[model samples]
Structures are given as C-alpha cells and as structure tokens.
Target: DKKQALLEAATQAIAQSGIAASTAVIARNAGVAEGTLFRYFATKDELINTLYLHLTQDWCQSIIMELDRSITDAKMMTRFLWNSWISWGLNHPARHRAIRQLAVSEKLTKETEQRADDMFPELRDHLHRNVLMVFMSDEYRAFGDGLFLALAETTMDFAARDPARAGEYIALGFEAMWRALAR
Candidate 1:
C-alpha cells in the first residue's frame, strides 16, 4: 500500500512536472516525509530508477495481456511482439508515452538499463528471430526485421509529434514495410 502510494504520487508528478524534478515532490504528494522517502528508496535516483523499471515492466505486462494468443506461434513471436507493441501503444496512450520517455531519458542510467535488460529474453526471443533473418539470401530479407521495426517506430514517432498528418505517415510506413517484406 505504501509503495503504491509512492508510485501514484510519481505518476501525478510526472503528469504535472517531468520526471527530472520529482523525488521530494512525489514523496510530499504521497503524504510521506521527504526523509521517509529514503526508507523506501535509498536515494532519489534509486526511486526514479525503480520507477522507470517497474513502470515499463507494468506496461509490458499489460501489453502481453492484450496480445491475441492465436497469432503468437513459436517462430512468429517476433512478428506478434511487433504487432502487439503497436497495438498496445495505440490503445494505452499515456502509459505508452511514459514508457517511450523512460526508454530514451538520459536520467535512466546505464545501470538501470542493465538491470532492465535482464528481462530481455522474452523480447530477444521474440525480436531476435526477425533480426536473425540476416542469414537469409534475400536482400531485403536480411534486413527484414530492421526494416519493419524502423518503419513502426518512425510511424509512431511522426504520429506523436505531428497530429495533423499522423496516420498518413503511419500508412506510409506500413506500405513501405509491406513492399519490403512482401512474400
């Protein structure tokens, strides 16, 4: 319950202020003393680290839940993971926004990323299959995963940054991917 309060406070702080300015503020808003915050987190940096870790963790769990099990066959996990990612981001706006920010944030230390990476086999197993197609003889097939992955990310990035032409670029990316990867 106490940790939940802290996370809730962090969420509110993030919604109001960016993550960079919010350890003491989050503690205060959570109704815990600033010093008491240390009992929960050894340092403010640690608190942010934990939040980055768990927040993304929570999103991953939520996303996996939304995936249709029928499409996630063994060898196709990577494709499913990719599609599931785009679907979840489209569905859960704020959490998707938060996860992307945390992913690229400078405050999220290498140590934090390293810790988070321990959880990557599920990601690796899913995505690496596509990446490993580099061995295939087909020219584009060698870059198939990279090709489509970049397309997805670029589509989303443009969409988020520019509302007027968001879906247009998304469709453009989808078309490029289909042309590149068409069987």
Candidate 2:
C-alpha cells in the first residue's frame, strides 16, 4: 500500500512541480513521512529514477496490451498504436505528464531505455524507417521513440481543446504521422 501510495503521490507531485518536486510534498501527498520516501528510495534521485522506470514500463505494457497482434496490415497496426496511445494519454493525464517529464529530461536509465526498445521492437524499427524517409536526421534515427512520444503529447494537447471533435483531428494527426514514418 505504501509503495503504491508513493507512486500515486509522486506522480501527482511531479506532474505539478516537474522533477524538482520536493520529497516533503510527495510525502504529504502520499500521507507518509518524508523519511518513508527515503526508506524506499535511498535518495531523491533514486525515487525519481525508480518512478521513471516504473512509469515507462507501465506505459509500454499498456500499449503492448492494446495492440492487436492479429492485425497483419502495416497501416492498420500503425493506426491501432496511435489510437491506443491517444486513449492512454487522455485517460491518464497526470501519469502521462509525469512520464513526459522523465522523457524530456532524459533522466531515464539505460536499462529503462533498452527494456523499452525490447518491448516495442517492431514499432521502433517501423517508426525509424518512416522517420528516415521523412526527416533524414540522426535525432529521429537515435530516438524514434522520443519523436513519436512528442507527437503523441502534441496530439493530447490538441485533443484537450475540443474533445467532442477529437476523432476528426486525431485521425488526421495519425494519418500525418503514418505517412511521414511508414513505408
């Protein structure tokens, strides 16, 4: 219960204050003592690192679960991935933001990075090929996951504005991403 509470509180606190969010605020939010965080984390950096690793794993697992392995069509798989990502972000705004914080800060560990790559092997290769076709920049080549995430976050912002019309624009965004990235 305490571990889950710490995660929940950390998400809320970090989302509000970015990674600079204090251990005291997180402890208060978690309804635990500041020292309790250290008991689990050893240090503030350790807590953030653990949180980022957990969040990243959870996010990838969510997408993997949502993906329909039976869908053989390449474009269909791309669309499925995009829609699932949008739904996930829309459903978990705080967690999504917290994940984004870790991503943008580049604080995630190499293990987290490699694990994510292993978890989404096909998606990375597929997206990287698309990126090579479009941008031809090493940025996309080295960090295809990063680029796709930035696009998803942008879609989340656009979707937040007029959710009733979300479908209209989300489809449009997905199409643009697919065309730019896919073969």
Candidate 3:
C-alpha cells in the first residue's frame, strides 16, 4: 500500500493546505523520507498530475467506457451514467474529492482537460447526446449544457458523500432533471 499511502498523504495535505502542500509535509504525513517521495514523483505537480490521470482513467473505464451503443436506449444511458458516476464517487470519496479539486486548479495545464476528452470520447458524446435527447432548441441546449454540468456535479457530490442523505438528495436531483426536460 505504499503508493496508496503516498496518495492518501498527498490528498490529506492538499485538503489541509491546497497547492501549498510541500513534499516535506506529505512525506512526514506518509511516514516516508522526503527523498523517497521524490523517488516516487519528481515534483508535487507531477505527483498530482499522475494522480489525476489514474483517477480519471478509472472513472472513464467504469462509466463512459461501458456505455453500450447496441442497447439502442438513450434514457437508459443517462440513468446508467448518473448511477455509475455516483457509485464511483461513493466508493472513492477521497480520491474523487482530490481529482475534483485539482481539476480546476491553475496549475493543472489545459492539456489535462483536452487529454481526458481525447482519451474518453464517450464523455463528450454523452453530453451532446443528452442535449439532443431532450430535443432542446439550439439556444436552450446551449444554456442547458452549462447549467446541467454544474448542477450534476454539485448534486452528485452531495449525494455520493452523504450516505445519510444520499437517497433523499439523489431523488430530488433526478426529479429536478426530469422536470427540466419534461417541461
């Protein structure tokens, strides 16, 4: 569990101090030498970038990669995608939070986003397909694109991490989405 230990320490440090987390502090937390941390990663950014790629790849394979075109069902895909993402976040809350925070960091280069998109076409495909599924007009579709992604992430985070409240929150979230599209 050395690698996991390192990642957990990094996540803890970043959670406590953001990007200001240093190798020394991470190593101290992980109970490893500072030099040993560098041996695993060249720099703090490198470690974070590596973590991002690994976590994103896991997410893509788990949810988007399994999207079956032969099913001939778009609504099913929407529900599946939602459940798959929520399931993953439920299973790996710490890692999910780490990736979510790092995703919007200035230090994470633009290529990170482009690389993820290129690696996982289904993510983009689903977004576009979702808009079409609702048959929204061009203007409405454009507006909904931004709105849904924000709402989905915010709601998913709340539902995935709060086991005591996940059931209630997810029901409301799904209902809200249904209402928006049903209108």
Candidate 4:
C-alpha cells in the first residue's frame, strides 16, 4: 500500500501547495523515503500524471456508483449526474482540488489526459448526446464542455463556502447549465 499512500500524500500536498509540491515533502507525508517514491514512479511528472488518472477514475467511479440506469429522461439523468459530481467534489475536497491543479498544469502529457478521458466513456457519450446536442448553436456546442466544467467549478466553490445553502447552489447551478444549453 506504499504506492497508494504516496498518491494520497501527493493529493494532500498538491491540494494545499499546488503542482509545485515537492516529492520530498510528499514522501515525508507518506512515511516513505524520497528514494522510495522514485522507485514507485520514475519521475515527478509521472507521479503527477498517475495521480491525475487516479483522481479522474475515482471521480468517474463516484458518479457511476450513484447513477440510476432506469432514469430515462435526459434532463433527469443530467440532474442526477450533476448532483453526484457536486457531492463527490464536496466530500473529497482535497482530491478535487488536486485534480483541478493537475488538470491545468503543463506537467501532464496529452497521453495522460487521453487516458483519463478513456476512463469516462459512458459519461462522455451521455454528455455529448444529451447535453452538447441540446445546444442551440455550433458555437455553444464547440465550448459547451468547457463552459459546463467552469460552471461546475464555480458551483462547487460557492457551495463549499456556504454549506447551509449548498443545495440551493446545486439546484441553481444545474438550472443555469440547463438553461444555458437549451435551444
């Protein structure tokens, strides 16, 4: 479980200190030697990319675990997904923050991103079909994914700050996304 401990330590360090977090610190936090980390991951970049993939898979698994396949209505299904995503981010703030940091960092390779994308085949297909396709214009279709993610991040930030109003934020956030994509 040394590898898993290292990843968890990395998540904590990265969440608090960003992608610049040092491997020595990560190793210290994980109760392992810096040399041990390099043994598990050939390089810092490799460790980061692996952590990104791990967090991405964990997030997708969280959504899938809560999904109800019998929900035939596209709008309802989207709501379900939105709620699941927001809840997961809220529950695992460190992992969420770490993933967000890694997502925009230059250290991650294209192949790492592609591997992360491959982990969410069903989610991607569903979003493309139900969400992006609902967009009224080609312009919206082009940027819908980015727009949705940006809004989701904003929603999570606000909800985290105001736990008493988290549900309100979640509901309003979903509505905002739904309305924006509507024809």
- Estimate the TM-score of every prediction: 0.61, 0.82, 0.67, 0.84
Candidate with the greatest TM-score versus the true structure: 4
RMSD of each: 6.6, 2.9, 5.2, 3.4
lDDT of 2 by residue, 1-183 (tens): 898899889998898899999999998888889998889888887778778777877777889887777877677777888998888888889999988877766666667667666767877776655445544454454364566677778888889898998886689888877665556
Question: What is candidate 3's CA lDDT for residue 64?
Answer: 59
Q: Which TM-score value belongs to model 4? A: 0.84
Task: Report every candidate's CA lDDT.
Answer: 0.63, 0.78, 0.68, 0.85
Query: Candidate 1: deviation at residue 153, Å?
Result: 7.7
Root-mean-square deviation of candidate 2: 2.9
Which pairs of residues collide in candidate 4? Answer: none
- Order the candidates by TM-score, highest first — what do you get? 4, 2, 3, 1
Comparing candidate 2 with candidate 4, which one achieves the higher lDDT? 4
Tens-digit per-residue lDDT, 6-49, candidate 4: 99999999999999999999999999999999999999999999
Q: Residue 131 in model 2: shift from native, Å?
A: 4.9
Whichever of 2 and 3 has more TM-score, that candidate is: 2
Residue pairs in clash, model 3: none
Backbone atom clashes (below 3 Å) for every candidate: 0, 1, 0, 0
